[PDB]
C-alpha cells in the first residue's frame, strides 16, 4: 500500500558502529530512503536473472549477478550451504541479535568425506501426448463417540434409506421400528433427519423427503425408545415438509401433495403422543398453522399444508378453525371458475385445496346440521361443499347399514 523502507532506528545503530555519537533524526531519514531505494533496484534486477534464466527460486547468484551489473563490489561468502540463524541477546537494556559464528579444526576440512562427482548434461526424449491424452510412462505425472458396532449400524441404516433399492429400505425401516437398543443413536438419527430435510432447500428432492418422513414414521413406532428429548428437532422437519412452498423439482407433475398429507398425519401423531400441558406442542402447532392459513399472500401449496395439518388434528379443530373461513372458498373460486389466466399452476393447487377442504368439511357439515340438507349446498359457498356434505351423509348412512 505504502512505500516501505528500512527503519530510521536501524541507522542510529549503524552510525554507532562507525563512531558517530549523535545523529539527528532528519539525517537518519535521509539515510534510510536511499538504502531502501538501492535495495529495491537490486531486488528487481536479481529478478531479471531469475526470469530470463528460468529458475523461479532467486538463488544468491542472482543478486551477485545484479551487484555486478550496478558496478558495486561483490559480497564474498554467500555461495556456501547456509541458512538464516540469529541469536538473541537480552542484556541489561540493549536488545540485539547476532550470528554466533563457530570454529572448526583445519585438519577436519582436509579430511572431510568428499561428495560424489557430478554428471554431465544429456538429453532425453519421451512422448508427452500421443494424439490426445498423455501416456502412462514414468516420465509423466501419475494421473460420546459411537463404538464401531453401532457406527457401522448407523452407516448401513442411513445409507439404506437414500434410495438404491426399496427392499433394503423396507428392512431398514423395519429395523428402526422394531429394535430394542437403538438409544445412544437417537441423537445421530435426529440430526441426520433434520439436516437432510434442510438439504431439500439446495436440492428440491421430493423422493428423499418421502424417505426421511418414512424414517420419522418408523422412529415413532419403536416402543423402546422415547422421543421426548429429541422431538424439538423432528417437529420443525415435519413442519418443513408440510408448510414449505416448493416441495418439488418440477412443480406441476411431482405429487408434493402426498408428502403433504403423510407429514400432516405424522404431525397429528407427534402431537397426540407427546403433547403435555408443560409442552404446549399442539397449541403451538395449531397457532403456526392458523396464522399461516388466515394470513393472505400465502401460496396454495402452503395453504394446502396448513389445511391438511389442521384437518388431521381432529373434528373440533376444523369446527373452530376451518369453518369460520369457509367464505375463503369464494376467494378460491374467483381463480378457478373464472379467469383467462388458465395455463398457470394456480389452478391445480387451487382445486386440490378445494377437494381437501370439501372432503374434510363434509363430516363436519354432517355433524352440525339437519338430516334433510335440502339446499344446504346453496346456503354453502359455491354450492359444491353442500353437495359433498350430502354425499358424506349418504356415506354415513351406508356405514350405519354395514354396522
Amino acid at each position: 500500500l505504502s512505500n516501505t523502507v528500512l527503519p530510521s532506528e536501524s541507522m542510529k545503530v549503524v552510525a554507532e558502529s562507525m563512531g558517530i555519537a549523535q545523529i539527528q533524526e532528519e539525517t537518519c531519514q535521509l539515510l534510510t530512503d536511499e538504502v531502501s531505494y538501492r535495495i529495491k533496484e537490486i531486488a528487481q534486477d536479481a529478478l531479471k536473472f531469475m526470469h530470463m534464466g528460468k529458475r523461479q527460486k532467486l538463488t544468491t547468484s542472482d543478486i551477485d549477478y545484479a551487484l555486478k551489473l550496478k558496478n558495486v563490489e561483490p559480497l564474498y561468502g554467500f555461495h556456501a550451504q547456509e541458512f538464516i540463524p540469529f541469536r538473541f541477546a537480552s542484556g541489561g537494556g540493549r536488545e540485539l541479535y547476532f550470528y554466533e559464528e563457530k570454529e572448526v579444526d583445519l585438519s577436519d576440512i582436509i579430511n572431510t568425506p568428499l561428495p560424489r562427482v557430478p554428471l554431465d548434461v544429456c538429453l532425453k526424449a519421451h512422448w508427452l501426448s500421443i494424439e490426445g491424452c498423455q501416456p502412462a510412462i514414468p516420465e509423466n505425472p501419475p494421473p460420546h463417540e459411537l463404538s464401531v458396532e453401532q457406527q457401522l449400524y448407523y452407516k448401513e441404516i442411513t445409507e439404506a434409506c437414500v434410495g438404491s433399492c426399496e427392499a433394503k429400505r423396507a428392512e431398514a425401516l423395519q429395523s428402526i421400528a422394531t429394535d430394542p437398543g437403538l438409544y445412544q443413536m437417537l441423537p445421530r438419527f435426529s440430526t441426520f433427519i433434520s439436516e437432510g430435510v434442510r438439504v431439500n432447500v439446495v436440492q428440491n428432492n421430493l423422493a428423499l423427503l418421502i424417505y426421511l418422513m418414512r424414517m420419522v414414521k418408523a422412529l415413532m413406532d419403536n416402543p423402546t425408545l422415547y422421543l421426548e428429548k429429541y422431538v424439538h428437532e423432528l417437529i420443525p422437519a415435519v413442519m418443513t415438509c408440510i408448510v414449505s412452498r416448493q416441495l418439488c423439482l418440477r412443480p406441476d407433475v411431482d405429487n408434493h401433495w402426498a408428502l403433504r398429507d403423510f407429514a400432516a398425519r405424522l404431525v397429528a401423531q407427534i402431537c397426540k403422543h407427546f403433547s403435555t400441558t408443560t409442552n404446549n406442542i399442539q397449541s403451538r402447532i395449531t397457532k403456526t398453522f392458523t396464522k399461516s392459513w388466515v394470513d393472505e399472500k400465502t401460496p396454495w401449496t402452503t395453504r394446502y399444508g396448513s389445511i391438511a395439518g389442521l384437518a388431521e388434528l381432529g373434528h373440533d379443530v376444523i369446527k373452530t378453525l376451518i369453518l369460520p373461513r369457509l367464505q375463503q372458498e369464494g376467494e378460491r373460486i374467483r381463480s378457478v371458475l373464472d379467469g383467462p389466466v388458465l395455463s398457470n399452476i394456480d389452478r391445480i393447487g387451487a382445486d386440490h385445496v378445494q377437494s381437501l377442504l370439501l372432503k374434510h368439511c363434509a363430516p363436519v357439515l354432517a355433524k352440525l346440521r339437519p338430516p334433510p340438507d335440502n339446499q344446504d349446498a346453496y346456503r354453502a359457498e359455491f354450492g359444491s361443499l353442500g353437495p359433498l356434505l350430502c354425499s358424506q351423509v349418504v356415506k354415513a348412512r351406508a356405514q350405519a347399514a354395514l354396522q
Partner: protein, 77 residues
C-alpha cells in the same frame, strides 16, 4: 417455607457399577444383534436348519480375492 423458599438442588447421578455394566452390556448385545440380523436379511444368507431365515440367520460366506489383507490387518489403530 412455600412463602419464600427455593431449593436449587441437582440431579442424583447413577454410580451403580453393576447396573452400568448391565446397561452397556445389554445395549452392545442388542445393537450387534440388530446389525447382524439386518445384514443377514438384506444379503445372501445361509442357515444351519432347513429354510431357517427368521431364527438364526447367517451372513453367507463370500470369498475374497486377497484374503490376507482382511485377515492379518488391524482395523482399529
Amino acid at each position: 417455607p412455600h412463602t419464600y423458599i427455593k431449593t436449587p438442588t441437582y440431579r442424583e447421578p447413577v454410580s451403580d457399577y453393576q447396573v452400568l455394566r448391565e446397561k452397556a452390556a445389554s445395549q452392545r448385545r442388542d445393537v450387534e444383534r440388530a446389525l447382524t440380523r439386518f445384514m443377514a436379511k438384506t444379503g445372501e444368507t445361509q442357515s444351519l436348519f432347513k429354510d431357517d431365515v427368521s431364527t438364526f440367520p447367517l451372513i453367507a460366506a463370500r470369498p475374497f480375492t486377497i484374503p490376507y489383507l482382511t485377515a492379518l490387518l488391524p482395523s482399529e489403530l
